[PDB]
Design a protein around this ligand. Structure first.
Ligand code: A1CL0
Length: 166
């Protein structure tokens, strides 16, 4: 968990402008969080980038998980291998508010982080899921109590989050 160059936002939330894939390779954290969908189909965004970095090993494992256990629910999670990126990958489903999924489930999604002492993660429900990323950072800060290191790819978004917060 050799996190470097993070800005401390609260006693347990840290933020950096970085590619989460590169952070996972440099740090080899105990847990990397995936911004997943209920069928664990890692087609784009952060999910597609993490899967690509494992050379599809994450997708083959995810398919076997779904055949045995069924899909997750919105607001839920499962722990699978982190492959070459981490000891574990915590797959978490935030609501896709553009498909009518309730924004109240974004608190349930962040609650899954509390089963892990330290996590490297993206903001949930940002990008294609449609939630406002600054609102997602506020829910993370209010809900997560363990130590979370957030990676934000886009520098324009990172500066907006740091300005709104501090
Ligand atoms: O900074 C982020 O967590 C966000 C996104 C991201 C991040 C890394 C990605 N890497 C490759 C392709 N697409 C990506 C999208 C999309 C929404 C916010």
């Amino acid at each position: 968990n050799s996190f470097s160059g993070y800005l401390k936002l609260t006693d347990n939330v840290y933020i950096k402008n970085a590619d989460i894939v590169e952070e996972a390779k440099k740090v080899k954290p105990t847990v990397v969080v995936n911004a997943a969908n209920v069928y664990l189909k890692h087609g784009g965004g952060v999910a597609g980038a993490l899967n690509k970095a494992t050379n599809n090993a994450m997708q083959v494992e995810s398919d076997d998980y779904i055949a045995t256990n069924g899909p997750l629910k919105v607001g839920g999670s499962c722990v699978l291998s982190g492959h070459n990126l981490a000891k574990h990958c915590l797959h978490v489903v935030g609501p896709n508010v553009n498909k009518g999924e309730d924004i109240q489930l974004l608190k349930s999604a962040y609650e899954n982080f509390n089963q892990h002492e330290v996590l490297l993660a993206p903001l949930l429900s940002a990008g294609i899921f449609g939630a406002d990323p600054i609102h997602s950072l506020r829910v993370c800060v209010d809900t997560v109590r363990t130590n979370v290191y957030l990676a934000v790819f886009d520098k324009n978004l990172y500066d907006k989050l740091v300005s709104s917060f501090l």
